[PDB]
Amino acid sequence: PQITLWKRPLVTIKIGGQLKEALLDTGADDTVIEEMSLPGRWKPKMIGGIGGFIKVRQYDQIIIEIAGHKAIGTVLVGPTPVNIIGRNLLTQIGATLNF
Amino acid sequence: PQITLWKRPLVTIKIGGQLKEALLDTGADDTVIEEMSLPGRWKPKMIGGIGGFIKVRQYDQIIIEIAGHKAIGTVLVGPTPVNIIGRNLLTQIGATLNF
Ligand SMILES: COc1ccc(S(=O)(=O)N(CC(C)C)C[C@@H](O)[C@H](Cc2cc(F)cc(F)c2)NC(=O)c2ccc(C)c(Nc3nccc(-c4cccnc4)n3)c2)cc1
Ligand SMILES: [Cl-]
Ligand SMILES: [Cl-]
Ligand SMILES: [Cl-]
Ligand SMILES: [Cl-]
Ligand code: NA
């Protein structure tokens, strides 16, 4: 698709069998999702946003579908205000910015 | 142009007679710039994201040039970690996300 930006670029994702809403976010290096259960071990990560820092749980090699496009990669889990799909997964789905 | 997302999508902007580097940010509703002076009226606002909220000054009807493309709109000024070009100005330069 070609997604214009008059509204938030929200898509459906599928992670852990479940559908969620998420924001396609070119300003995010990494993908950050609200609290949920994921398999395997996690590693610590601190990320900084507009208001300060939050600790998240880093899960690697997670299967995740974004707007119907299959990806496998890192997902950060923690107290984000909204689910955000960052560049690590935008690159897997072949997304670019165009003007 | 077509901008890939292997790295942060940074561009040069001109705002208030100054050159700055800023991130093209589809996850940002509004444009947020580090502390600077702008002409005209403003009003206070709180904006939120990862890590909580910051207080900003809202200036309306500000001209900007984003990677060579002019537009006009609201600019929020305050203690953002990164200068952000949000959707309110990305729409005006015709930016889309494509995959
Ligand atoms: C109404 O208008 C507005 C309201 C809110 C905003 S916003 O809050 O800016 N935001 C809203 C979304 C979160 C929904 C836009 C979003 O793209 C922001 C833009 C941003 C990037 C950044 F980068 C630092 C910042 F403030 C801000 N993304 C993240 O916060 C972001 C997204 C993902 C990650 C992983 C990180 N943090 C990060 N990334 C890599 C490394 C580190 C790091 C590593 C080691 C030490 N410290 C930091 N942190 C940050 C904008 C306009
Ligand atoms: Cl739109
Ligand atoms: Cl990844
Ligand atoms: Cl505006
Ligand atoms: Cl349009
Ligand atoms: Na004004």
Active-site residue flag, B30:
no
Distance CA B16, CA B59 (A): 12
Token pair 């909220």 is at which residue?
B53
B residues 7..36 contacting A (CB < 8 A): 8-9, 23-29, 32
Looking at the CA of A6, name the nearest ligand.
Answer: 2
Contacts of A55 in chain B (CB under 8 A): none
C-beta A51 within 6 A of ligand 1: no
| Tokens standing for residue A92 | 């897997």
Distance CA B70, CA B92 (A): 8
Q: With an 8 Å Cβ cutoff, is A98 touching chain B?
A: yes
DSSP-derived secondary structure for chain B: -EE-SSS--EEEEEETTEEEEEEE-TT-SS-EE-S---SS-EEEEEEEETTEEEEEEEEEEEEEEETTEEEEEEEEES--SS-EE-HHHHTTTT-EEE-
Report the b/e string of B56-89 with b at 16+ CB within 10 A: bbbbeebebebbeeebebebbbbebebbbbbbbb
Distance CA B30, CA B83 (A): 11
In angstroms, what is the span from residue B74 Cα to ligand 4's centroid?
Answer: 4
Resolution (A): 1.1
Nearest to A40 by CA among A12, A69, A63, A68: A63
Per the CB < 8 Å rule, is A99 touching B69?
yes
| Tokens standing for residue A8 | 């938030």
| Tokens standing for residue B62 | 């500000």
Phi, psi (degrees; rounded to nearest 5) at A24: -75, 115
Experimental technique, in short, is: X-ray
Distance CA B52, CA B82 (A): 15
Distance CA B56, CA B66 (A): 21
